[PDB]
Design a protein around this ligand. Structure first.
Ligand SMILES: *C/C=C(C)/C=C/C=C(C)/C=C/C1=C(C)CCCC1(C)C
Ligand SMILES: *C/C=C(C)/C=C/C=C(C)/C=C/C1=C(C)CCCC1(C)C
Ligand SMILES: *C/C=C(C)/C=C/C=C(C)/C=C/C1=C(C)CCCC1(C)C
Ligand SMILES: *C/C=C(C)/C=C/C=C(C)/C=C/C1=C(C)CCCC1(C)C
Ligand SMILES: *C/C=C(C)/C=C/C=C(C)/C=C/C1=C(C)CCCC1(C)C
Ligand SMILES: CCCCCCCC/C=C\CCCCCCCC(=O)O
Ligand SMILES: CCCCCCCCCCCCCCCCCCCC
Ligand SMILES: CCCCCCCCCCCCCCCCCCCC
Ligand SMILES: CCCCCCCCCCCCCCCCCCCC
Ligand SMILES: CCCCCCCCCCCCCCCCCCCC
Ligand SMILES: CCCCCCCCCCCCCCCCCCCC
Ligand SMILES: CCCCCCCCCCCCCCCCCCCC
Lengths: 288, 287, 288, 285, 286
């Protein structure tokens, strides 16, 4: 049992405050993001609408999830003379974040695949692999960290982490292939953006596995705090800052389809205060 | 008596965690689905809007229902240090799922019937039968499993299950007939989709009856866990993965009506990244 | 003495059934509310009052039934196979009255909206119906719950009689409005409105009947019958009957389109049969 | 004479039920109103949209406010042998309504001023908002804040100060209506005047209910005060809400008929068509 | 050494006033949020970022003030001496920081969005402003609450100074962005942006001032002043100032319409004066 469960460490009043601060800030940040995404939903064409639906979903899930995390945090610790002593529900705080990831990660995959121009059959199978892979990845981590022996078995904590890494590789491969296959077809401007979005979205992922193995280096009120805050900052940075990257690709791809004369969009599309497309209406049709 | 109520079995800390995980994940999955369905609502024409309304409703019901299920689970169990001992309200967890099905299943019927080209009163009669049948199917199961003798009576548990199966057959027949009657009128591409949707939507149903009869083979923390999780996974797989099927049919049927020149749609309709219809605006009218 | 229903003890089976129907009802309204909202632009500006009223009714019902459910959960205490009523049990019955007070009046407006009543004639009718319906429920509430904690037989009867007076006033005005409008409407519209009017008003009888049941004694079974019957009645009326009014509005909209009186942006379909074709208002060049 | 705080009176089980009934009914009535206002938001042009925004806001504030009032009522009283005995939180019920008025009243001003006709319009809005805001705050200070509302002197003094603000508000609005009436069409002229009169008249009820506690305290009086205010809030904030909207719609239809601007959908008032549907002329850039 | 405000006992009158302003504020935001949402299509696609930012800020404020209200209700206990602070009283002050952490940054984006800085320069400007404003509040939270439960006078001041450094960085970038954009804008537009920039930035001073009040001692009256003043400040800025940014966007939209740069579906009206007439995009063949 070389594993030192983080929900066992007692927290200082200062630490307790910091965790709460970041958790709520995150939740509010998602509310702001969710609102933005919704209002800026018709800035994209019908073809890439799946990208908008996915991100809005991810943000929605994150908001509600972080509300549960906050609740668990409030019911997970009790105030004493020595600070905030963990109770039976403390484990729920860590558990809830996994739930978030289980649904959030898969949706991200779809978002990237949505902006990716993979056509017909190749695309459908890719989606299934990515979703199942990402879903399994988090489930394996949850099993090892929380489900098995109340996360007290050192070997499983590692074994399942390795199994998860397997899925992480499967996911990255499929996505990277899809991005690589689509890059040549896109315009130079589009090509650069997709690659940029793909790299930004996948890079951050490493932080999560790193934070997962931190408990092995021992237990501490400070460590527990670091684990929670780091993960929170990571969730916000990725699920928020990276959210715009996918959207931008969709918008440009939309404007390009307009300029190219492939389709007509109701409103002018602007990126970085530069006009990419002009407002257009479909030609009136007289039915038989 | 041979019936071993699942809400009587004690659950391990691991089991308790797993159940919670799947329940919440499911609820969140529905929120994501509900959001998607809403945003992708104008991708369909006015003719097949009933399909969109039904699915969004089903998802909405599921979301709220699973919230109740989750709450009951949290307020339905207590920790004894030997696991989680059921409260008097734990039965509510199982009860709530029935409530979900009672409202959710009927809406599904309407959704399939909506994509179906069955028109006139004959189709209206079909809707009434499907809804009433599906509604009764779940109610009969609820009566036997929970209402009668607090689910301690083996006779009712089975009798009512059989009565329910009767309704299940009535529902499947009407729906299958409606799909079969509509299939010939639809285009080849549309024909394939409806059949596909019909098969996928109806097939899964079998899982529910199977899980219902599991308690007869005894009671255990593991079994109780299997029952709950399996049903949850089933609900998500059907109410979600199967939801897209109906929507796609509606979109294509809309695009076809556009191409055929029968009707006009404001935006281009894309399926599988392949354009099915082009942007169109109705002719300006003078009075 | 009047045998108050909130005094009778309920079996575990009975308690479960009541909960089942209450929640199912609430969820049914959520499904209805969602449908009504999505299918709001299927109607013209002229009959929008009908849409606003139904969506309102459904919204009120949903929230109301949530309160009813809460009251039900806090109104009874478990005693090993039996549920003994507490001081809050009365609230369950009280809450339904609140629902009716707001819900019934909105229904009136909905029917009157689809009705062809023009000018003041229409406005006057609405005022009478709303005030009448509003008072009818209030009178019942006073006799059944407010006066002597609902234990006075004389008041229970007196106020019910007063209520019936208002019920007659309401039915008369509405029936007249429907009868006056039927001749002007098309055959297809005539059938729907008449059907809606008849369907909407007929069910009302059930409510008064259930009200006087307590007089014939008190029992766990009776109390169960009262609650469930009212719930089934609320759902059947507020839901199944909701479509009837909406359909009239849609057809009346399509008729206005075909007749060339007005233009609708999208095609209107009833029972899979096209009633109207998509039309756009003629572009106008303002003086500028 | 003597100020007798209403949150001191014990309430009967019957009284407790009545108050709950009206409070919830009111809240639900606002939900129904809020939904209607939202659905019937595009029935008005861009010029008078401030009227729609204001009313929807007022209704929204009222709904949430009445939710707090209901909560306070549930946590403000404890059930006893003699009925429902007030606790420390009972005062919150009365306090919450003031909060509602402080935000709700100002929005109403904007709504009427929105339908009303330049630069001096902005000044008028500032006066109305500040005046209305202060009027309620002054009453709050005297009735609740000062000496826990047990002082007859302030209860009256501050009421008088408030009345001063009430006069300022009514004057600005009355002037705005009077100044605008001549410019508007006869049909529009009648509407605005009608709306102005209906919106301002009711206000008197609030001050009247305020001074009732002076004539003593009782479970019945406390009940009368609460219910009357509730009925008043619903009647004004709801029935009166339509008045402003109608003016906006007609003024929109007039702009359409006159050819000044175009509206996408047909505008109907009293089951009578005011404007036929129109789309803006396609523009090349 | 620092007299924490959550240590002072409050009178029944004081307790009532704080509650009054807090709720009024929350409701004011609800009214604002509703208005902003309904008046979202009064602006063009080009300046939509401004609308998205303000609606977000208002949304955050509303929810935040709900938490502040809850904390206030669970932070004090009624006694014979008035309302005695408990362990949760500190949360009231803590929650406001959370609000500011998300609210302030969004404001920056809103002003920068109306600002015409083009290319990465605006994106670079955005990143600095967001991070600067974010850090500013975090530093204050650290010193006021996190460090020694706000009992260390040196930190209370040190971190305040560090924060002020960030405040200067933020003001500079924004002022530069406004100054750089001002020349490109029309005279009418130019005036509004400057006014909005000045109005948005000026108020900021109040917050730092209120922060250092606890140093001059602790009291039920002072605690009351701190809370109410901040609340009034939040509403006045986040609300009254919200319109300023929006108005600029609307005019800039109308100008683009008149100039023939873009087409807007509906007429745009500011102060009851028509700025742009309704226009529909030309139907296109593919
Ligand atoms: C929006 C949130 C995201 C993208 C979260 C991602 C999380 C991971 C990539 C987690 C991966 C893990 C491993 C590869 C090994 C250890 C267990 C996990 C689940 C933390
Ligand atoms: C979205 C959820 C769905 C479609 C659930 C379906 C459930 C059934 C088809 C249940 C059928 C049953 C029987 C035929 C016998 C035993 C009792 C039931 C209700 C489980
Ligand atoms: C959505 C619910 C509806 C339309 C409910 C209608 C209820 C009534 C018509 C009630 C009438 C009553 C009497 C005429 C006498 C006894 C008391 C009442 C209120 C139940
Ligand atoms: C929507 C609610 C409205 C318009 C409420 C209005 C309230 C008043 C006009 C109150 C006025 C008062 C006085 C003039 C004196 C006493 C104190 C007040 C605030 C009740
Ligand atoms: C919408 C709310 C706003 C803009 C709040 C602004 C707050 C500040 C400008 C705070 C600045 C501070 C310092 C510069 C020093 C002391 C600590 C702070 C955070 C209060
Ligand atoms: C918007 C985030 C809300 C998080 C849950 C808050 C629950 C109540 C606690 C308040 C302190
Ligand atoms: C079986 C009980 C629930 C069925 C609900 C079906 C949806 C009803 C929608 C009605 C709309 C008016
Ligand atoms: C309209 C449906 C009424 C059902 C009443 C059920 C009565 C409960 C049985 C136990 C006595
Ligand atoms: C009006 C809506 C209020 C919502 C409140 C949500 C949080 C409640 C926290 C209660 C803690 C005891
Ligand atoms: C729409 C008004 C509902 C208010 C709910 C207040 C809480 C009641 C008990 C739960
Ligand atoms: C039963 C004693 C309380 C009755 C007072 C109710 C007054 C209602 C006034 C409405 C106008
Ligand atoms: C009762 C003493 C406290 C009152 C403080 C009022 C401060 C208001 C600041 C407005 C800016």
């Amino acid at each position: 049992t070389n594993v030192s469960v983080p929900w066992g460490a007692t927290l200082s009043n200062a630490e307790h405050q910091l965790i709460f601060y970041f958790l709520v800030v995150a939740a509010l940040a998602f509310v702001a993001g969710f609102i933005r995404t919704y209002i800026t939903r018709n800035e994209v064409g019908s073809r890439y609408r799946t990208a908008v639906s996915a991100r809005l979903g991810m943000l929605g899930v994150a908001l509600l999830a972080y509300i549960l995390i906050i609740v668990a945090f409030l019911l997970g610790y009790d105030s004493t003379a020595g600070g905030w002593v963990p109770n039976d529900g403390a484990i729920n705080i860590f558990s809830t974040r996994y739930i978030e990831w289980t649904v959030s990660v898969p949706l991200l995959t779809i978002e990237l695949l949505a902006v990716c121009a993979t056509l017909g059959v190749q695309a459908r199978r890719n989606t299934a692999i990515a979703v199942t892979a990402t879903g399994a990845m988090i489930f394996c981590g949850f099993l090892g960290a929380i489900v098995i022996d109340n996360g007290t078995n050192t070997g499983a904590f590692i074994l399942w982490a390795v199994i998860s890494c397997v899925f992480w590789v499967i996911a990255n491969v499929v996505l990277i292939r899809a991005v690589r296959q689509s890059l040549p077809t896109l315009t130079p401007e589009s090509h650069t953006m997709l690659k940029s979005a793909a790299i930004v979205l996948l890079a951050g992922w490493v932080v999560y596995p790193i934070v997962y193995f931190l408990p092995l280096f021992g237990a501490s009120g400070g460590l527990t705090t670091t684990i929670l805050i780091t993960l929170t900052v990571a969730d916000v940075i990725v699920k928020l800052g990276f959210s715009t990257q996918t959207h931008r690709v969709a918008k440009l791809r939309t404007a390009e389809d307009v300029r190219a004369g492939d389709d007509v969009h109701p409103e002018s599309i602007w990126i970085s205060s530069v006009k990419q497309s002009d407002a257009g209406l479909p030609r009136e049709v007289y039915l038989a």
